[PDB]
Structures are given as structure tokens and as C-alpha cells.
Amino acid sequence: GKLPPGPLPDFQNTPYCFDQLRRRFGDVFSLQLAWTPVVVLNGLAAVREALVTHGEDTADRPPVPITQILGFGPRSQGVFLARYGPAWREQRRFSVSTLRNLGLGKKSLEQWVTEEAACLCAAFANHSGRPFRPNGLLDKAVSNVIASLTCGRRFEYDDPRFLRLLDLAQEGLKEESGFLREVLNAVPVLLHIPALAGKVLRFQKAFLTQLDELLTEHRMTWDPAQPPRDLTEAFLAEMEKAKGNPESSFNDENLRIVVADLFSAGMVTTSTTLAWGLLLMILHPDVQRRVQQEIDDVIGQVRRPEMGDQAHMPYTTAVIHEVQRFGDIVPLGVTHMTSRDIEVQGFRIPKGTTLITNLSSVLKDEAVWEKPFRFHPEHFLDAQGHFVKPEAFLPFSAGRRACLGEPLARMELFLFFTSLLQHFSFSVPTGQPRPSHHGVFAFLVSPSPYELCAVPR
Ligand code: HEM
Ligand SMILES: COC(=O)C1=CO[C@@H](C)[C@H]2CN3CCc4c([nH]c5ccccc45)[C@@H]3C[C@H]12
Ligand SMILES: [Zn+2]
Ligand SMILES: [Zn+2]
């Protein structure tokens, strides 16, 4: 019956504000947000006990009433915010299998991705030696991979339509984390204001409208006499089989949501990580070199990198993992909700509690890591040079709801990162201030804006 302690009754600096209460109230503390009961879980032990040991009872999401404006319904919840049940599980399993069939785990996708990587290197080379922000090109190359798997196509980097889409996307994930958002969610009555309605999800509504245009084009070009060559076709073919089934989540309202969930995560998570990687590589030249040495030793500058190389590349694998750990791009993951009463670290957490997993607190757990607040590839290495992955490596969270795109993310990071470091040497532009290793918090945590020089080898 013991409830977790907490203060009794910020939105842009949420991560660090929680770290404050952690040292004060402990690793499992309660907190009051509007009318909504929230419990924050900190450190591996508490997150693991919640998401794994009590996995069945914490795999639900908080109701989010605003998503009604985006056409959400019982059988239309996408994957991310989908309530725990049939609509969630059908889409979740569909995405996981469909990715696999499309070539995830095969040289098929491997060779495609490493081809977009070549497009990325040519875009970089076109800056000659001049300083530039690598973010936009990172977003394009990484969007194309997920666009290809879901939408059956890539875009040219100079494509106007593609640019409006990446912008709407970026500006939309911003709206995922808002003060007003939490307001209309704990107070669902506010949606009844048609004037106030529009402005809530300005960009997300507009992103879905742009995605609709692409999906419509895609219905026209689809050859249903052929095995589906991407996720949208596979979805469309299920949608056909389900004509007459009001229970199926394969409906038109859910196609735009599912593809929005997958496209946006497949883009903003991975490229932001890579922006982190490139920033850490110019702040730590010694590390950048030691990676390039391994690349040469194992691959040379002849052929494109392959996933078969990662096995024999423990240092590069280390660095990439440490980028994720240090970069820490999703400090608070995605909220969960208890669907049942549970006990965590000795405290009672009632059914219906909003659970926040503090992934930052696990990734930078001072008890687990040698130098939690430093960029230290040896966190994933031993004295012998072998790669080790500590249990506290949870940038993808844990449980029934853990990132379904992790295998895609891992192959993208390895191939893009190695390809870039295989062909370029990155540096802070002479005469410019040393860039902050601190990050700026949107919904995600991104590096603070920086430029670099990229000179070929
Ligand atoms: C560096 C790359 C990535 C990181 C760090 C990351 C991290 C995460 C995190 C923290 C969650 C929340 C898990 C939870 O609810 O406890 C999640 C879930 C999810 N991710 Fe990822 N992710 C990455 C890449 C991707 C990719 C490439 C895709 C799509 C192909 C993707 C799609 C999803 C989806 C759909 C969910 C919701 C899972 C569910 O609700 O069952 N993510 N991810
Ligand atoms: C730019 O806007 C979007 O991508 C979206 C629009 O409407 C709904 C379907 C939004 C639902 N939202 C659910 C949560 C979430 C999303 N993308 C992520 C990417 C990483 C982490 C979390 C998320 C998606 C983004 C979706
Ligand atoms: Zn197609
Ligand atoms: Zn060893």
C-alpha cells in the first residue's frame, strides 16, 4: 500500500527537472500533472522491474484525446499511441514482419542503405571543404531509407515536395511535447473550441495531409498482381482482405497514421543520433581516427561497408553505442500506463497511473557506468578490446513496447556512420568556437547547432 513519495501541488527542461527530484525522493517518485497521476521511474532496476517484470501490466498508453483531430478511433490508433490490445498488436506485428520480409536482415536492405549512404557522401563532398550544418542532409538520407521501405520510393535531396515533408515532420514531432497538449489531454473538454481546435496540431495535421498526397499517388502506381514491394502495399493488400470486417485495424484512417508513426521515427531518431555522432567525432578527433583505422583494417576505402564487418569492428561498434548512450536522444521515452496494480522497488503503483520511464537515468546511471557524463567508448569495451553491451544500454527501452525499429536503426547507424568516416575526415571549422557537447531538448534531444568541415581522404 506504500505509494511513491513526491512533491504536492517545467515543460521544456523536463529531463533535468526529474533528475532533481530523483536525488531528493528516490528512484521511484510520484508527481502531479494537472488531474493526471504520474509516477517517474529512474535507473535500470526500477525501469526493468516496471517494463519487464511487470510487462503485461505496463504495456498500455495513456489516453490521448487530442488524437481525435487526426482521425484516431478504436481501430485506428497507429502503433506509438495505440492502446494496449488488438489495434496495437495487429499493427505492431504487421510492421515487424513486413520490415523483415522487405529485406531487413538481408543483403537486400543492407545494399540499398549503403547506396543512400553514397548519395550522402556526394552531397557532403559538394560542400568542398567549406563549413556547413550536416543535419539537413542527414535527415534526407535517413528519410529516404524509411520512405523506401514504407512508400516504395526515395526523393532527390533538392526535391521541393520532399523538403516540405521533412519540415512538417520535424515541426510535428515538436508538437508531441507541449504544455497545451498536456492541458487538453487531462482536460478533454477544451477540444470543443473549433477555433482553439485547429491550432493544437497545426503541423501534424498538415504533415498527414502531405502524406495523404503521397499515399494517393502510391495507390495509382500499385501493382496488386505483384508481391508487395513496400510496407504501404502490404498494408493495402491486407486492407483488401479485410473488406467487411469492422474489427480490422487495416482501414484507411489507420494507414496514414501507421505510416506517419513509422516514417517520422525512422527519420528523426536515427539522423539525430548521427548528428550526435558527427558532433562527438569532431570533439574527439582521437576517437574518430581510431575508428577510421579499424575501417581501413577491415574494409579499406574500396568497398562499401557491410553488416558482416561489424562483427570484426568492435571499436566502431563501441563508439556508435556510446554515441547513443551519450547522445541520449529520448530522455523520457514514451509514457506508459499501468493497466493493472503493481509493485515497483517496494512502492505500490495503482492501475491507471501514467508511467514515465527515465531512460536518461539508465543510460547515465552513475552506479553502472565508469564515466556517465563523458563521451567514453570504453564503456562498451574491455581491456582486451572486445565489445560488451551492459544491461543498462536501453536507448530503445524495454518490454512489449520496446522500439520495433531497433534492427533497422542498428544497421542504419553502422552503415551510414562507417560510410561517412570511411570517406571523410570531420573537424571543427578553424576559427570557430568549440561546439557545446550539450544538447537542446525538443521532444527529442538534439545537438546544439554546429558546423563542421568534411575533407575527403
Ligand atoms: C536511434 C534510433 C531509435 C531509437 C533510439 C528509438 C527509441 C525508441 C523508444 C525509446 C521507444 C519507446 C518504447 C516504449 O514505449 O517504452 C520506441 C518505440 C517505437 N519506435 Fe523506435 N527508436 C529508434 C528508431 C526507430 C525506427 C527506425 C523506427 C521505424 C522503423 C521506430 C519506430 C518505433 C515505433 C513504432 C515505436 C512504438 C513501439 C510500440 O508502441 O509498440 N523507431 N523507440
Ligand atoms: C509530424 O507528425 C507526425 O509524424 C505524426 C502525425 O500525426 C500522428 C499520427 C503522430 C503520432 N506520433 C506518435 C508518437 C511519435 C510519433 N513519431 C515519433 C517518433 C519518435 C518517438 C515518438 C513518436 C508520431 C508522429 C505522428
Ligand atoms: Zn509501392
Ligand atoms: Zn574480452
Swiss-Prot record:
Presence of the UniProt keyword Iron-sulfur in the record: no
Q: Which one Pfam family would you cite for this protein?
A: p450
Gene Ontology biological process terms from the UniProt entry: alkaloid catabolic process; alkaloid metabolic process; arachidonate metabolic process; cholesterol metabolic process; coumarin metabolic process; estrogen metabolic process; isoquinoline alkaloid metabolic process; long-chain fatty acid biosynthetic process
Q: What is the effect of changing I257L?
A: In allele CYP2D6*24
Report residues binding heme.
C403
Q: Where in or outside the cell is it found?
A: Endoplasmic reticulum membrane; Microsome membrane
Q: Mind telling me what this protein is named?
A: Cytochrome P450 2D6
Organism this protein belongs to: Homo sapiens (Human)
